[PDB]
Amino acid sequence: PYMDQVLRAFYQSTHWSTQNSYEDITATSRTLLDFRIPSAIHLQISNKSTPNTFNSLDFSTRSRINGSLSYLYSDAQQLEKFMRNFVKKSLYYGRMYYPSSDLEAMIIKRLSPQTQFMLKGVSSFKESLNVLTCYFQRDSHRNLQEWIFSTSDLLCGYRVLHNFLNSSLSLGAEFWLGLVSLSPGCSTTLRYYTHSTNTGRPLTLTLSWNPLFGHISSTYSAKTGTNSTFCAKYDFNLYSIESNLSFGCEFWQKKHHSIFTSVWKLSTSLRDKTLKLLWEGKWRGFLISAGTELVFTNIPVFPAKFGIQFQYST
Amino acid sequence: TFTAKTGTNFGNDNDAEAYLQFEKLIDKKYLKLPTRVNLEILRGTKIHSSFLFNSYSSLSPQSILNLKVFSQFYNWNTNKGLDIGQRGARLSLRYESPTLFHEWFLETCWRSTKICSQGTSAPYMYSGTMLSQAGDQLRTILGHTFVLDKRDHIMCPTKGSMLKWSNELSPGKHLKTQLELNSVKSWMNDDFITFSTTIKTGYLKNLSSQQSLPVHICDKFQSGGPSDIRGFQTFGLGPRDLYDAVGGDAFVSYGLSVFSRLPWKKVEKSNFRLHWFFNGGKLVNHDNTSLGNCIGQLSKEHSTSTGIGLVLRHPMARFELNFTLPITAHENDLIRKGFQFGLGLAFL
Amino acid sequence: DTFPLQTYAAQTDKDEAVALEIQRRSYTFTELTVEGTYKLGVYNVFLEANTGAALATDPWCLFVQLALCQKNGLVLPTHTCNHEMLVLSRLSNPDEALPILVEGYKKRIIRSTVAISEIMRSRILDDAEQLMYYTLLDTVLYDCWITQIIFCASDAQFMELYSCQKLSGSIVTPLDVENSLLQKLSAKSLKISLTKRNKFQFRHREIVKSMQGVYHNHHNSVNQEQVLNVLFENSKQVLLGLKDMLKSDGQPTYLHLKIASYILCITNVKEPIKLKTFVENECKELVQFAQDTLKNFVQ
Amino acid sequence: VKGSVHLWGKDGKASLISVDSIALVWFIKLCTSEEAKSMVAGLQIVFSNNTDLSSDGKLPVLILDNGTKVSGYVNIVQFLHKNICTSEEDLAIVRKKDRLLEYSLLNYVDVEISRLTDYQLFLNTKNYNEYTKKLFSKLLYFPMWYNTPLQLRSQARENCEEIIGESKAMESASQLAQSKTFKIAHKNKIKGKQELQQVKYNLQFDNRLQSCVSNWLAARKKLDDSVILSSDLLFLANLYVQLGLPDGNRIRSKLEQTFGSELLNSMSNKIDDFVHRPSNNLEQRDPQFREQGNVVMSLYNLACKYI
Structure with missing residues (x-):
């Protein structure tokens, strides 16, 4: 999204290390595998109106001209440089989408050198839900203890991420307790950023868990190349065994003679029996993002949901 | 370029x-x-x-x-x-x-x-x-x-008045005259209390040979709304056929407004103001002969509303969140009691 | 809920130029109180030379009009709160198709064309043989009428029939100059809405796609001339077979009111659109049938 | 008459995505009488599978030695019955007194019953994904495979809509990953609403087919019930597709409760008789390089529609 990209430029400007949190812990396993394929032809232009107000617009063949009016204010005086992929700082974000007047907001207030706070409201007029969450969190050098109070029903939560000890045998958890739904939830993660001498590469062995369902997962994610990257997730389940094996082959490039950069992607799934392809090519301001999805289950190979997506911005 | x-x-x-x-x-x-x-x-x-x-x-x-x-x-x-x-x-x-x-x-x-x-x-x-x-x-x-417009600013002023006068002649069909006054006055040191008055009148004549050729619904006057008399729904005043606002051939619409710059000192010197308003107006169909019996109708039973609220006044927009109370109304007007959200450029 | 301190009577001032336009389009079905009335919204209204009554200019609107004078025991309006027949625009509905029915005053129900089509065909749905004939008129004879009024009649014969815009005598007043400019700008926009009524845009997707377009090249014109020619050859075979289906045994059936409403609207067209030239010359029993069917609705 | 009938099939028999080509093969195969042979003599069936040779995009076209295109099954049959020489077994020619009811029946299968078979070819998720969308790979050429059943499914949705059936993503994206238990049950509130909606669609279908076959069979008993008319061949070509699909056994049962089993098996005795008849009457043809719809010929046919 763009709410989850504004969040990452505030963190890298305040040096908060979002990669040690329990929302970027299985990061490579989802950016190479569960990317979005555009389902139609698409055009988009973004701009910037006031010093603290951005504007967007898009129209596809399906939907008409949409839009959004962003607001963004922050005391972080190196913010906008990391938008493009002690002082008690702050951030205020707010965005209304206007074919439909769907709101959203975000308030960050770094209350200490090692403690934050995060409001995240999403208040849609239609499909009505005033979700209003609060993410108190106390970072340290070995933790990211992070309490969440949502307002979907009354959903409270918890997270923790204890780093151990290249060999980084990390650990995580979460313990969610719906105060109205009475439906708990848990997890565990044992990721391991390592180093090897085959190509020069990390690994990501995400030995996940969910002890209520027995829903163990896995993940392997190599970096076989100086630019390319490969991943392979093996889903599983306990007491009701039903597997999967996904894939992903994000392949980079750089071109010169503004500089053209092209990032290829694949996603071979086996339980879904599909093959997702996508090419994402940038420029100074322009960005073309095409993508197809072949389904293998005569003529089995039927490319459902082709799409291209143009985007210019500034 | x-x-x-x-x-x-x-x-x-x-x-x-x-x-x-x-x-x-x-x-x-x-x-x-x-x-x-x-x-x-x-x-x-x-x-x-x-x-x-x-x-x-x-x-x-x-x-x-x-x-x-x-x-x-x-x-x-x-x-x-x-x-x-x-x-x-x-x-x-x-x-x-x-x-x-x-x-x-x-x-x-x-x-x-x-x-x-x-x-x-x-x-x-x-x-x-x-x-x-x-x-x-x-x-x-x-x-x-x-x-x-003798005001020093258009969206967030602190002195001076404004006079806008419009005419529209669709020849042989209708003649439409509108006026809008405005008057902004401030009484404290750093423009802390700002008292703003608006008056909008309008008149529309049917010039079309013994009341043939009606004037369109998009050409008649409408009253009510966040950007008009607040504390009524938009298209919420005037005469009605069944439940539809059929517009008016003449109107008057006024309004007071006091602003107060939020006396919490850490949020002062901002574009937020503590807003109190008293709106009101009348929308009428005027039995299309004179200008004298039209004022006998336009000044008889107004649809007023008061309310407090909080307003942002930026040069690009004015956001208004009010708690409005209809003081008087007609029995079929669309009322919108309680909270009302305003957004736009021109308010009255 | 106590807060509006004074509340006044509703407001009783009306535009008397709106009530003069509604009175100029309303035709009153002669022969109950405020809520037991309907207003049949039609495209326009013509004047019959024989009976002098106010018939509607579209074959569907005239069918629903005669089916209301049969069901309710009315007499046709001539060109104490009786029912009504309004001349409306197509754009008075989201459907943009127009026979509609405006029932009631304070509890006002609007039946669209598709709602009236389900109502009108379910009253002879119990017969299966006459439902085949009703469906043949509504598909084969309807599609010849539409293609010869959208494509084969002039843009002033179309807007005479399918528009509530004012038929001026000639171009004398500067008001009459720009009334003639509307019938040029808004002719193809009214033709496009008429091709959406009886699922004509789905039986005829290609000659409807060529209407939403410019300059009318030879490929779309030599295909339309082939589609419109087999549409007319079929309808010559429809109308010639109907002449053995005109025997009256009393009150007219909903098929006899639909054969009559196509003949009464084909013979109103002032141009030789080839359905008029065929009905006048070869179907002279159909013209005589459609006048005998009509004269039990006049006084 | 002298012409060339274009169809949808693949080189020996008409395809099941079009009941108007199936019924027209049987119509030509069953002209065995002396009078019925005269209206069909020299018709030269072509299986071109390209709709650019049509006057309206539909592909039983009769392009008849002048450029006069007659399109669709009902228009061709009424054209051929009009062009007999004028001077009982396997295809009847109805008399003057029965020409109107036989056209009324032919038109009723075209507008009411063939609206239901194009539901079952494209708007049935069991039939469209298994059978239909993998049938155009056999008929058309190399770039034009994924637009023809996609446009034909959009056409059948518009044709059967009034009888049968950006913070929205970010709303759960702060909560559903943060709840992690109804991320598994985000699809479960969809297939829990998908389940009572497809049986909601199968009831307003199956009483429309219960009424369109009841109306047609009640008007068919006004003509001669012992002889084969050209309206029977379009009715049977609608059963032969509706029963022969992947979801045909649900419909062979549903028609057997209302109309019996002595009639659904009497209709399928005529149906399987008509498919297994010899093609000695059929004089076929191969398409030329103006009738194929190649990659180079469907761009020349793409520019002429704007020129």
């Missing part, structure tokens, strides 16, 4: 809309009158879009010809239950610390009116008045707008 950009409309009823606007400053060979053309595309309504050409050409140091070719489609009256489309041209000539300008236009427009509400939503937009306004019309209109 080109500046293909994107913005936000801040239009009629609280609901902003995206536009995409390509400019082109024409070079000094098809020129010696410094001309820029525009092409602004907006979201139409569900079949069509809204294209809006412009061609501003500075004739004199104080003269600008605008040639505006529009093809715009938009939703309208209360439940977005009316679909309006407009095709035509507009040749407009604008003549120049107090802002003063006169602006004469000449517009030919073909207007399609569609009842786009569903027949399950049963008596709304399906009155005898709205059933007969659906159709197609062509309409040439001549105008003159005079604006004398």
Whole structure:
């Protein structure tokens, strides 16, 4: 999204290390595998109106001209440089989408050198839900203890991420307790950023868990190349065994003679029996993002949901 | 020179809309009158879009010809239950610390009116008045707008008055005269308390040979809303056929406003103000003979409302969150008690 | 809920130029109180030379009009709160198709064309043989009528029939100059809405796609001339077979009111659109049938 | 008459995506009488599978030695019955007194019953994904495979809509990953609403087919019930597709409760008789390089529609 990209430029400007949190812990396993394929032809232009107000617009063949009016204010005086992929700082974000007047907001207030706070409201007029969450969190050098109070029903939560000890045998958890739904939830993660001498590469062995369902997962994610990257997730389940094996082959490039950069992607799934392809090519301001999805289950190979997506911005 | 950009409309009823606007400053060979053309595309309504050409050409140091070719489609009256489309041209000539300008236009427009509400939503937009306004019309209109704005700012002022006077003559069909006063006055040190008064009157005559050719629903006056008399729904005042606001042939609309700059000191010196207002007005159909019996109607039973609230006043927009209370109303007016959200540029 | 301190009577001031336009389009079905009335919204209204009554100019609107004078025991309006027949625009509905029915005043129900089509065909749905004939008129004879009024009649014979815009005598007043300019700008926009009524845009997707377009090239014109020619050859075979289906045994069936409403609207067209030239010359028993069917609805 | 009938099939028999080509093969195969042979003599069936040779995009076209295109099954049959020489077994020619009811029946299968078979070819998720969308790979050429059943499914949705059936993503994206238990049950509130909606669609279908076959069979008993008319061949070509699809056994049962089993098996005795008849009457043809719809010929046919 763009709410989850504004969040990452505030963190890298305040040096908060979002990669040690329990929302970027299985990061490579989802950016190479569960990317979005555009389902139609698409055009988009973004701009910037006031010093603290951005504007967007898009129209596809399906939907008409949409839009959004962003607001963004922050005391972080190196913010906008990391938008493009002690002082008690702050951030205020707010965005209304206007074919439909769907709101959203975000308030960050770094209350200490090692403690934050995060409001995240999403208040849609239609499909009505005033979700209003609060993410108190106390970072340290070995933790990211992070309490969440949502307002979907009354959903409270918890997270923790204890780093151990290249060999980084990390650990995580979460313990969610719906105060109205009475439906708990848990997890565990044992990721391991390592180093090897085959190509020069990390690994990501995400030995996940969910002890209520027995829903163990896995993940392997190599970096076989100086630019390319490969991943392979093996889903599983306990007491009701039903597997999967996904894939992903994000392949980079750089071109010169503004500089053209092209990032290829694949996603071979086996339980879904599909093959997702996508090419994402940038420029100074322009960005073309095409993508197809072949389904293998005569003529089995039927490319459902082709799409291209143009985007210019500034 | 080109500046293909994107913005936000801040239009009629609280609901902003995206536009995409390509400019082109024409070079000094098809020129010696410094001309820029525009092409602004907006979201139409569900079949069509809204294209809006412009061609501003500075004739004199104080003269600008605008040639505006529009093809715009938009939703309208209360439940977005009316679909309006407009095709035509507009040749407009604008003549120049107090802002003063006169602006004469000449517009030919073909207007399609569609009842786009569903027949399950049963008596709304399906009155005898709205059933007969659906159709197609062509309409040439001549105008003159005079604006004398002695205020120091347009959206967040602190002194001075404003006078806007409009005329519209569709020849042999209707003549439409509007006035809008405004008066902003401040009494404290750093413009802390700002007392703002507005008065809008209007009058519309049917010039069409013994009351043939009715005036269209899009040409009559409407009252109510966040950007008008607050504490009533938009299209919420005036006479009605069944449940549809059929507009008025004359109106008066006033309003007070006090602002207070939020006495919490860490949030002072900002664009937020503590807002208290008293709005009100009357919308009437005036038995189209005189100007004397029209004021006997226009000053009899007003639809007033008071309320407190909090307002942001930026140069690009004015956000208004009020708690309104209808003081008086008519028995069929649309009331909107409690919280009301306002957004736009012009409030009254 | 106590807060509006004074509340006044509703407001009783009306535009008397709106009530003069509604009175100019209303035709009153002669022969109950405020809520037991309907207003049949039609496209326009013509004047019959024989009976002098106000018939509607579209074959569907005239069918629903005669089916209301049969069901309710009315007499046709001539060109104490009786029912009504409004001349409306197509754009008075989201459907943009127009026979509609405006029932009631404060509890006002609107029946669209598709709602009236389900109502009108379910009253002879119990017969299966006459439902085949009713479906043949509504598909084969309807499609010849529409293609010969959208494409084969002039843009002033179309807007005479399918528009509530004003038929001026000639171009004398500057009001009459720009009334003639509307019938040029808004002719193809009214033709496009008429091709959406009986699912004509789905039986005829290609000659409807060529209407939403410019300059009318030779490929779309030599295909339309082939589609419109087999549409007319079929309808010559429809109308010639109907002449053995005109025997009256009393009150007219909903098929006899639909054969009559196509003949009464084909013979109103002032141009030789080839359905008029065929019905006048070869179907002279159909013209005589459609006048005998009509004269039990007049006085 | 002298012409060339274009169809949808693949080189020996008409395809099941079009009941108007199936019924027209049987119509030509069953002209065995002396009078019925005269209206069919020299018709030269072509299986071109390209709709650019049509006057309206539908592909039983009769392009008849002048450029006069007659399109669709019902228009061709009424054209061929009009062009007999004028001077009982396997295809009847109805008399003057029965020409109107036989056209009324032919038109009723075209507008009411063939609206239901194009539901079952494209708007049935069991039939469209298994059978239909993998049938155009056998008929058309290399770039034009994924637009023809996609446009034909959009056409059948518009044709059967009034009888049968950006913060929205970010709303759960702060909560559903943060709840992690109804991320598994985000699809479960969709297939829990998908389940009572497809049986909601199968009831307003199956009483439309219960009424369109009841109306047709009640008007068919006014003509001669012992002889084969050209309206019977379009009715049977609608059963032969509706029963022969992947979801045909649900419909062979549903028609057997209302109309019996002595009639659904009497209709399928005529149906399987008509498919297994010899093609000695059929004089076929191969398409030329103006009738194929190649990659180079469907761009020349793409520019002429705007020129």
